[PDB]
Design an enzyme around this catalytic site. Structure first.
Site, PDB file in Angstrom:
ATOM      1  N   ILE C  19       0.884  -1.167   0.000  1.00  0.00           N
ATOM      2  CA  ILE C  19       0.000   0.000   0.000  1.00  0.00           C
ATOM      3  C   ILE C  19       0.930   1.227   0.000  1.00  0.00           C
ATOM      4  O   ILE C  19       0.686   2.228  -0.698  1.00  0.00           O
ATOM      5  CB  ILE C  19      -0.929   0.034   1.293  1.00  0.00           C
ATOM      6  CG1 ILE C  19      -1.928  -1.120   1.263  1.00  0.00           C
ATOM      7  CG2 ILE C  19      -1.633   1.367   1.451  1.00  0.00           C
ATOM      8  CD1 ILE C  19      -2.906  -1.105   2.478  1.00  0.00           C
ATOM      9  N   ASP C  63      14.019   0.869  11.994  1.00  0.00           N
ATOM     10  CA  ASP C  63      13.263  -0.183  12.678  1.00  0.00           C
ATOM     11  C   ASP C  63      12.524   0.478  13.857  1.00  0.00           C
ATOM     12  O   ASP C  63      13.150   0.783  14.889  1.00  0.00           O
ATOM     13  CB  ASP C  63      14.178  -1.279  13.233  1.00  0.00           C
ATOM     14  CG  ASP C  63      13.405  -2.333  14.024  1.00  0.00           C
ATOM     15  OD1 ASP C  63      12.162  -2.207  14.157  1.00  0.00           O
ATOM     16  OD2 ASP C  63      14.044  -3.301  14.500  1.00  0.00           O
ATOM     17  N   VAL C  64      11.207   0.665  13.701  1.00  0.00           N
ATOM     18  CA  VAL C  64      10.384   1.316  14.717  1.00  0.00           C
ATOM     19  C   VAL C  64      10.335   0.694  16.114  1.00  0.00           C
ATOM     20  O   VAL C  64       9.833   1.331  17.052  1.00  0.00           O
ATOM     21  CB  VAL C  64       8.932   1.538  14.207  1.00  0.00           C
ATOM     22  CG1 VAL C  64       8.970   2.436  12.970  1.00  0.00           C
ATOM     23  CG2 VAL C  64       8.255   0.224  13.876  1.00  0.00           C
ATOM     24  N   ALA C  94       2.474  -8.370  13.873  1.00  0.00           N
ATOM     25  CA  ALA C  94       2.025  -9.177  14.986  1.00  0.00           C
ATOM     26  C   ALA C  94       2.609 -10.564  14.709  1.00  0.00           C
ATOM     27  O   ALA C  94       2.539 -11.069  13.587  1.00  0.00           O
ATOM     28  CB  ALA C  94       0.518  -9.212  15.052  1.00  0.00           C
ATOM     29  N   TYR C 155      -8.131 -11.929  12.609  1.00  0.00           N
ATOM     30  CA  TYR C 155      -7.422 -10.663  12.701  1.00  0.00           C
ATOM     31  C   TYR C 155      -6.973 -10.596  14.163  1.00  0.00           C
ATOM     32  O   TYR C 155      -5.909 -10.020  14.502  1.00  0.00           O
ATOM     33  CB  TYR C 155      -8.334  -9.510  12.283  1.00  0.00           C
ATOM     34  CG  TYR C 155      -7.579  -8.274  11.828  1.00  0.00           C
ATOM     35  CD1 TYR C 155      -6.671  -8.339  10.761  1.00  0.00           C
ATOM     36  CD2 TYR C 155      -7.699  -7.084  12.537  1.00  0.00           C
ATOM     37  CE1 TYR C 155      -5.892  -7.233  10.428  1.00  0.00           C
ATOM     38  CE2 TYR C 155      -6.933  -6.004  12.236  1.00  0.00           C
ATOM     39  CZ  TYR C 155      -6.028  -6.082  11.185  1.00  0.00           C
ATOM     40  OH  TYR C 155      -5.233  -5.010  10.974  1.00  0.00           O
ATOM     41  N   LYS C 162      -5.108  -2.035  16.148  1.00  0.00           N
ATOM     42  CA  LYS C 162      -5.681  -1.017  15.251  1.00  0.00           C
ATOM     43  C   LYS C 162      -6.613  -0.024  15.944  1.00  0.00           C
ATOM     44  O   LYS C 162      -6.750   1.160  15.511  1.00  0.00           O
ATOM     45  CB  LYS C 162      -6.431  -1.648  14.052  1.00  0.00           C
ATOM     46  CG  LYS C 162      -5.546  -2.266  12.971  1.00  0.00           C
ATOM     47  CD  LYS C 162      -4.396  -1.374  12.467  1.00  0.00           C
ATOM     48  CE  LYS C 162      -3.461  -2.167  11.558  1.00  0.00           C
ATOM     49  NZ  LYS C 162      -2.591  -1.370  10.642  1.00  0.00           N
ATOM     50  N   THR C 193      -1.380  -8.029  -0.370  1.00  0.00           N
ATOM     51  CA  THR C 193       0.007  -7.573  -0.161  1.00  0.00           C
ATOM     52  C   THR C 193       0.820  -8.609   0.643  1.00  0.00           C
ATOM     53  O   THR C 193       0.258  -9.579   1.160  1.00  0.00           O
ATOM     54  CB  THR C 193       0.042  -6.265   0.628  1.00  0.00           C
ATOM     55  OG1 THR C 193      -0.349  -6.546   1.979  1.00  0.00           O
ATOM     56  CG2 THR C 193      -0.892  -5.206  -0.001  1.00  0.00           C
ATOM     57  N   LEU C 194       2.134  -8.403   0.757  1.00  0.00           N
ATOM     58  CA  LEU C 194       2.993  -9.333   1.503  1.00  0.00           C
ATOM     59  C   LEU C 194       2.383  -9.714   2.839  1.00  0.00           C
ATOM     60  O   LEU C 194       2.032 -10.876   3.057  1.00  0.00           O
ATOM     61  CB  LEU C 194       4.356  -8.717   1.776  1.00  0.00           C
ATOM     62  CG  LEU C 194       5.245  -8.532   0.553  1.00  0.00           C
ATOM     63  CD1 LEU C 194       6.470  -7.675   0.921  1.00  0.00           C
ATOM     64  CD2 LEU C 194       5.632  -9.905   0.014  1.00  0.00           C
ATOM     65  N   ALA C 195       2.272  -8.726   3.728  1.00  0.00           N
ATOM     66  CA  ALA C 195       1.716  -8.911   5.072  1.00  0.00           C
ATOM     67  C   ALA C 195       0.401  -9.693   5.094  1.00  0.00           C
ATOM     68  O   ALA C 195       0.108 -10.396   6.062  1.00  0.00           O
ATOM     69  CB  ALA C 195       1.519  -7.555   5.748  1.00  0.00           C
TER      70      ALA C 195
END
Ligand SMILES: NC(=O)c1ccc[n+]([C@@H]2O[C@H](COP(=O)([O-])OP(=O)(O)OC[C@H]3O[C@@H](n4cnc5c(N)ncnc54)[C@H](O)[C@@H]3O)[C@@H](O)[C@H]2O)c1
Ligand SMILES: NC(=O)c1ccc[n+]([C@@H]2O[C@H](COP(=O)([O-])OP(=O)(O)OC[C@H]3O[C@@H](n4cnc5c(N)ncnc54)[C@H](O)[C@@H]3O)[C@@H](O)[C@H]2O)c1
Ligand SMILES: NC(=O)c1ccc[n+]([C@@H]2O[C@H](COP(=O)([O-])OP(=O)(O)OC[C@H]3O[C@@H](n4cnc5c(N)ncnc54)[C@H](O)[C@@H]3O)[C@@H](O)[C@H]2O)c1
Ligand SMILES: NC(=O)c1ccc[n+]([C@@H]2O[C@H](COP(=O)([O-])OP(=O)(O)OC[C@H]3O[C@@H](n4cnc5c(N)ncnc54)[C@H](O)[C@@H]3O)[C@@H](O)[C@H]2O)c1
Ligand SMILES: CN(Cc1cn(C)c2ccccc12)C(=O)/C=C/c1cnc2c(c1)CCC(=O)N2
Ligand SMILES: CN(Cc1cn(C)c2ccccc12)C(=O)/C=C/c1cnc2c(c1)CCC(=O)N2
Ligand SMILES: CN(Cc1cn(C)c2ccccc12)C(=O)/C=C/c1cnc2c(c1)CCC(=O)N2
Ligand SMILES: CN(Cc1cn(C)c2ccccc12)C(=O)/C=C/c1cnc2c(c1)CCC(=O)N2
Lengths: 258, 258, 258, 258
Positions: C19, C63-64, C94, C155, C162, C193-195
């Protein structure tokens, strides 16, 4: 019961399947003294018989389409309940045509008009008319549906009137809180009653609900009656202008069907 | 009462001002058989004395920061309640520093971490640990605040953990509904208790609330206790994954101060 | 383009399906000067290429999970941009074990902690670190998903992170608004997407979202990128602390499947 | 401009302060071909001038209270535009008596009926009338206010009409999505316009919205116009049935005043 000492007006009873019927029985079980309205000639009999069974002999006529009929009703009730503690508004209507197929093609200006008049305006009209008759500690209760928050196939214009009704719930609560009245709604999950069987695949819809609802079953008029009995009692003194979902958590989940 | 025959675990009691204290008294008044937890050495005494006064001699230690302590607690409770009907989760914490002044400057990774661990994760941790011990018909109840839905000065990171907690409410209800457990939260209006007086102008904030709240007063632990007693009983069988606002309609109004 | 003269940091780019990739594309087209970050070395080269293609040669490791890495990145960024106009937070994580099956059984204190630290706190962690570097008129943007508001199967704990992230949006907006910074989020509909690889029957899920969405198609990283360029441009000057749904209306319907 | 090649009907223009004016401006700049409607003759000339200034000479009478007038307008519109790309609904009304003081006392069946017919049904009334004329990719947009979601003093019955209007947005979106039409609304913050004259201490109110809004200023018809051009352009292709708040974050905060 938690409603002993209270006097509550129950409108909307039409058959033992009615939501208002489940609400009446539950408030009586908790000790409320009950009163009832009936819409027309066709229903008076049914309503007097149910009122008798729940110890009430106050059965009055009321068509919320007419301001004079609401005033008259509250005039009669006044000879018996100079004051009371609130009413359950369990009324709704939209002309047959309105609730089936594509929303944009079904709706009409009249349909829209009537649907909002009977299902939303009628709630504050009843309040207007009996305002001075309400004791502090009183509670107003109406019944709404998820269609007000999300678009649901076939519910069409009813969704618009229910949205108007919940907002009315909020404005009625903010206006009346100072004099001692609370006002809330119960957003009930779908239940097979008179007012439903005549529209769409309600039977297939209920099957879908039982499947994806967290409690894994659809709610009953006893469930609604119990929350209703509660919203209308002193146990919910801290709740007002709220729309409580009594739908088993249906609305707080998503994509369970997968 | 409407809770006779039920066994409920009440965590969080810390003084007679505590919300959990108002919730305990109300569930006992309705006939529930009660159990209690206490966090540490400092509180055991207070909690045993209150538990005694409400007919309970089940007073167990539990620091939700530790998985072993939650498991141990549920092991002891099991010798007495092989099974029970749910618990009230009335716990919250954020390191002093976190709740004062500009949010972006106050928050820290640790603060954020602890606040979410103690106020949100702790609710599903307790559920995980006692899951098999719950009867069908059981109800889980946590306490939340408007800060979760809107940004409120000084509440800072607590708002983020409360949001996490309400979402936990929804995911816990969706996961557990099939086995017979409901899970909800009460979003309570502000009440002067231990956990508050140490932060900001709480006194001036309460004055503001009483003024703009529809029922024109702030709610009490009796108000919360009553709704709590209700959310945890069979009278709310149709409600699950819901966040009920017991704040007198505060949140459904706007610009009343003008 | 409506983003001419704006300097925007874009995190999360990991492949052309990302995204963050769609977003980067749209802001470049709209004339923004871009900068990118990358989590680790495996992605260093891959990201530098993406960046060249967008008129950019500012490419930094970040890296957060570490305050030091975030601080170090912004110091490097500061060499070429003493001031800039906002950044795009496109980071979610996660542990794998966390996202599959019954939520109550899958979740763990550690999984919860990691999910919240990377998916939600990092967003304010970044704002903290570049606060004095933002120009007036700046905008910050993050990405959320409907699982924040509703309980969606698998999820699981991401739903809680979120909800925490959407609340972080409102607290960030409330605190940084006064110095001229707006903060919003886009709640995107399902995108491949990847994730998104390996969580359940994503594929079947995408097929459901497609039959039931008002627009009858899933959204694209181009649909999202355009809303994202809009949300970070002065065009949206009147929008702050909002969660905008770019899911083709999926979340506002109910029972379209039936 | 992002609106090049789009044909947009704009209703509600009545003076240069009008939100519809701000919107018209932004869509023109973004390259859209415009068309305007006017309620009555008093406004005929006034509106033709506004239209000339925007590259437009399509100016038609249209009183939304009448199906015949709406039908007639779209037939005229059809002479110069057999197909077009959507329209902006910028129409709200409620008899003056309706908007002042206690909501329960001020409201009347007639005031309610008019408020709902003009503010909410007209929006779908228009969509009904031009449905076969819309191109794929079209967008419809209406304006709402926070009174739909919250009870605000004096807004009284407009609150109900706006809640009905926001629900009309979701039902319209759900029904017209499949033929390629998106439908959304902008919930604008307080703006000084004609319709806003004479309701209460609007002035003082504007001063409140300004001290408490995250962005610390009220929004403008330019802020709204930009979001409106965005919402009706393919840039927002992934957004349908949404109520976007363009109020500088006012609605997402709470107690900033204290
Ligand atoms: N049944 C469900 O699944 C369900 C779910 C959510 C909400 N609701 C709402 O609950 C309420 C009760 O519905 P129900 O299922 O009990 O239907 P019902 O048909 O059993 O009864 C509703 C009542 O509407 C009354 N009514 C219609 N026009 C009236 C008028 N002009 N004046 C006075 N009364 C009038 C009828 O007399 C009737 O008894 C309604 O407001 C409905 O929209 C129903
Ligand atoms: N007081 C209010 O105005 C208000 C309003 C809304 C919501 N709430 C919420 O209601 C709940 C109860 O708050 P309160 O006002 O009764 O405060 P309180 O201080 O009286 O009690 C809350 C409890 O948190 C417990 N606690 C903290 N860390 C713990 C740990 N690690 N393990 C076990 N227990 C721990 C303490 O023992 C304490 O008794 C909280 O979740 C709070 O956020 C309070
Ligand atoms: N794809 C969807 O269906 C969807 C829908 C709605 C919201 N979102 C959200 O959008 C964001 C982007 O997701 P995506 O779908 O583009 O997947 P993605 O895997 O392509 O991108 C997410 C990024 O997470 C980054 N990341 C993970 N841990 C990090 C760390 N510790 N430090 C720095 N960066 C780290 C990776 O570098 C990666 O590029 C996420 O927050 C996601 O939750 C995704
Ligand atoms: N100005 C604000 O503070 C504000 C904030 C949020 C939303 N809104 C909404 O935006 C819209 C535009 O309002 P405004 O503030 O620009 O005021 P305005 O008075 O400038 O414009 C509204 C238009 O209503 C039109 N109208 C009224 N009855 C009509 C009828 N019967 N047929 C056709 N047109 C009719 C008038 O021609 C007028 O131009 C309204 O729906 C309003 O509720 C206004
Ligand atoms: C929730 N329901 C039941 C329901 C109806 N539809 C279409 C649904 C779809 C999904 C779930 C529940 C429902 C209701 O509120 C009833 C509405 C209603 C209003 N006017 C009516 C009729 C039904 C019927 C008779 C009449 O003349 N006027
Ligand atoms: C609703 N409240 C009370 C409240 C606090 N603030 C800041 C408010 C603002 C407005 C309205 C209510 C409140 C709460 O949930 C209490 C939160 C809380 C958490 N950790 C704490 C402390 C308080 C205190 C002690 C500690 O160490 N950790
Ligand atoms: C919307 N999505 C995709 C998605 C995931 N699940 C479970 C869904 C269910 C329904 C619809 C969409 C989704 C996301 O936001 C991505 C979340 C995510 C976070 N950490 C992860 C992984 C995915 C995966 C890799 C990792 O290690 N950590
Ligand atoms: C947001 N506003 C402005 C506004 C009105 N009130 C009462 C407010 C209170 C607080 C903040 C904003 C407002 C609106 O949407 C305008 C509504 C409106 C509708 N019909 C009207 C009038 C105003 C006026 C003229 C008429 O005849 N019919």
């Amino acid at each position: 019961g938690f409603l002993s000492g209270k006097r509550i007006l129950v409108t909307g009873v039409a058959s033992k399947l009615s939501i208002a019927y489940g609400i009446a029985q539950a408030m009586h079980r908790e000790g409320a003294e009950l009163a009832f309205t009936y819409q027309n000639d066709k229903l008076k009999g049914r309503v007097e018989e149910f009122a008798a069974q729940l110890g009430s002999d106050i059965v009055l006529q009321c068509d919320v389409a007419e301001d004079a009929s609401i005033d008259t009703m509250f005039a009669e009730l006044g000879k018996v309940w100079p004051k009371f503690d609130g009413f359950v508004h369990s009324i709704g209507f939209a002309p047959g045509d309105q609730l089936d197929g594509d929303y944009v093609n079904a709706v009409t200006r009249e349909g829209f008009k009537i649907a909002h008049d009977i299902s939303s305006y009628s709630f504050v009209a009843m309040a207007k008319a009996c305002r001075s008759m309400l004791n502090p500690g009183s509670a107003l209760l109406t019944l709404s549906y998820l269609g007000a928050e999300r678009a649901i196939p076939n519910y069409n214009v009813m969704g618009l009137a229910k949205a108007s009704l919940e907002a009315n719930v909020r404005y009625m609560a903010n206006a009346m809180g100072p004099e001692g009245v609370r006002v809330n709604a119960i957003s009930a999950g779908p239940i097979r009653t008179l007012a439903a069987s005549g529209i769409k695949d309600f039977r297939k819809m209920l099957a879908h609900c039982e499947a994806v609802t967290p409690i894994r079953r659809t709610v009953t008029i006893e469930d609604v009656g119990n929350s209703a009995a509660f919203l209308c009692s002193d146990l919910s003194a801290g709740i007002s202008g709220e729309v409580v979902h009594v739908d088993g958590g249906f609305s707080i989940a998503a994509m369970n069907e997968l």
